[PDB]
Symmetry: D2
Amino acid sequence: MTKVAIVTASDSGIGKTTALMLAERGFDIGVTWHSDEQGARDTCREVEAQGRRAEAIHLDLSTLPQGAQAIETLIARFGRLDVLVNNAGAMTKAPFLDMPFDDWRNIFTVDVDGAFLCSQIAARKMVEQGEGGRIVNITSVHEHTPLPEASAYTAAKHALGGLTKSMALELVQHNILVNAVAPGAIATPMNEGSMPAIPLARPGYTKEIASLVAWLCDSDASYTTGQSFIVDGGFMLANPQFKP
Amino acid sequence: NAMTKVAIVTASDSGIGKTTALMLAERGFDIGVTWHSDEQGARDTCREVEAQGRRAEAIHLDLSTLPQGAQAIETLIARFGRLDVLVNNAGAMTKAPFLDMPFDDWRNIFTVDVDGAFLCSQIAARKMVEQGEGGRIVNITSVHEHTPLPEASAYTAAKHALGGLTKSMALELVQHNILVNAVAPGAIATPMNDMDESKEGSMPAIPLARPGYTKEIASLVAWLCDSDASYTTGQSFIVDGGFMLANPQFKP
Amino acid sequence: TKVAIVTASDSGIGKTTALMLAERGFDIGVTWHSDEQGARDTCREVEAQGRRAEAIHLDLSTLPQGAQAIETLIARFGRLDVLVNNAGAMTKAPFLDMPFDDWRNIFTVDVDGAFLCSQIAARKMVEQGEGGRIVNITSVHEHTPLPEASAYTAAKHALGGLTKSMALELVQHNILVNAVAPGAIATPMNDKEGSMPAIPLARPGYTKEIASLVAWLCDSDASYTTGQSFIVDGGFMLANPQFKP
Amino acid sequence: MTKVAIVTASDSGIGKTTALMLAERGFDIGVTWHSDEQGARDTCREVEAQGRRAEAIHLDLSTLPQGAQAIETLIARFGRLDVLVNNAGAMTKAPFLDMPFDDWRNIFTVDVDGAFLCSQIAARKMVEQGEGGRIVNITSVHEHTPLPEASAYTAAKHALGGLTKSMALELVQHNILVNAVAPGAIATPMNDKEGSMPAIPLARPGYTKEIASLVAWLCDSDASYTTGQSFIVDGGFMLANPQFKPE
């Protein structure tokens, strides 16, 4: 009866803050971790401390399609699925001229291939239930504008943005709404005026991004699909004419 | 214990503005209501806003005759003594073929659809700057901020202009912690169908196959006005049911 | 012989465009705001290439009267096939205190003028039944804000939206409508490598680098291009807060 | 020295018309073919019929990264390289829910992995010469808007759109300008009529010359201020939203 949300990489950072906020809104949370399992255990306890069920599982998206079957197992532990938040990994810089081909392919494996497989498994279950669903892909401002010395990261983020539009169009008949949240600079887990290149002059806290993800998963977002919501402190506004 | 933040929502006598005012009042905002000619509808919004324990002040705003009509924003600010949120809600769309459009009709559409938002935003931003406590401005545009509406070239151009104004205001007021964003809605249900709840399949050209309820737009506007949206500025959030996805390859 | 009217072709992008359209075989309608003898320089250089050239005074600062010169210039040629709406000068003004008449005057010359000129030009092209081309010179600030110039940015966005509407409403008449969005343009004196390190190409653009694309959008190979904004900016749109010159 | 331009998949279609127009503008043409080797010879002959040298070689993008080494061989025949055009392959449809993971990865191989490796090879040589360069990627309108039942093709076109912006930014100090041309519906080689696609505003698909001409312009000397952009040539495809009523 209680709706279920699976938030990948919810052991720390933006994923964990999203899992907490989806638990506040009343979702049972399926937590996923790559290595920091204790961080996932902390997230599960904080979700249970809210009076909601929390399940954790290991999922390694660097090896596909095998590493994506953990979504199937997590769904069976709950018996239903309503929300999938595909969270974004870390960014790696690599100059374009000398980038190894396998490094280029590995970034696509982590930054779009995993989300594609996890969304397929999620979308199938949501089609069976016939009650709709929400799939939110965490991209980046670099879904739209290039990041210097990070051509593969920029291209994979653009690919995930294109997958978001496609998924939203093909699943609209099943009332499965698919959107992307495009964060700008995200403050480190340890963390005013520290980043003057950004118009807001600081990185964003995880709750300033996780809150919009939570809104997209709730009842009132029932007319929003196919879109990429940019939460970036004005990042997209700063062109060469902008002097801080 | 902090002083009650006040929000002004223009054209909040019905439709998106009415629903936004209610949801902002639900979030603890005192509401400044505005009506163009439906004075009774604005009193109904005030009654419902007051029903939640919030103060409601209404006033007549005639954005067709500027810059005089924009002074009503000053009057609402005087009643509350402060201002924290401004929502520039959109007037109705009128069609006119591009080839046969009088130059005064073209100018009038810009008067109501971007000039009014510009003048109201100035007064509001000036107040927020004087307070030094930041603020929020949300411009309600349209999907036609981004894609043309046939037989509505002035509407489309003015919506694009308000989109550009939104980005400029966001860049120019960011040091005052005044965040400025647009909400770009698709097809909205008329008040007869909006209150009736459930019209599925009535607009198959749109992927979601129906118009949106005012609640489905106002909820995002209200989110942009509250504390969690403190890192969102300069953006245009499209709430359209897939309208933007539908190209010539789309089959209803 | 086809006729191309180019506004503000007494200097700058408008003149280089007018000359390039003349090499492509167009008769050129030249327009001047104040520099009449500069317009005659354009007419003379167009005539040196075998084309007919005419000039007329156009002032879009006062509408709808100032736009009637287009109608008069059309009557001298009898036909019209190409209209290029050039972009006037940019003036800054802070948003909080900008006077309302300054806001309205920027919309008058930067989108209202293009509206009336395009309306007249499109009317003539419909009657001929042979299609046509309308090219609006916008700016990168059709898409991204210019600091301290909110009215300039809003009007450039507006002309961008008008371009799409005109393209969609006129497509059945084979009138293709597009925009060209220039970045920084060198002054006629410089028309340098490293003078603008904020821009990725590190320099402004020459008028031939903008006008060449405008001329392409006016010829027969651009017969499938409509409703678009072509950005020629040396990478201006690429430079975000992560770009370090 | 005669400037050299490599046009991938120039054995037919847009790549063929782009090669002939680049030859008309004075380029020596390096021709690439996946399977129609006779088409590449026809392209080589038509290029030579305009007073230009043409060289052909097999390029198998279905097997990387050694398959892209044919670009290094093609450069060695000319000794220099000035422009590279990464032309698109064919489009295949596959529903999202049941699409196999290998078909998804294969589409990315042919539609962005190939252009990535070819652009690395071309860009390095352009840096050696120090005389600037041009790279033009043929994407699609579906770099920007979804194609129904083709999520992998859409995602890969977006990816190539992102690579275009990244390349243009990192290569700009070497005067290597990188742009994309995003075509809409293109006519088949037999038809390359009016009113055949009323859903499109121009009510017809585009001719290959209508797309190749802009590609050729982006490669010539007057496009020296244009980089990082995606030029959409679609007959108003992008303008058509649910409010468009075909006349």
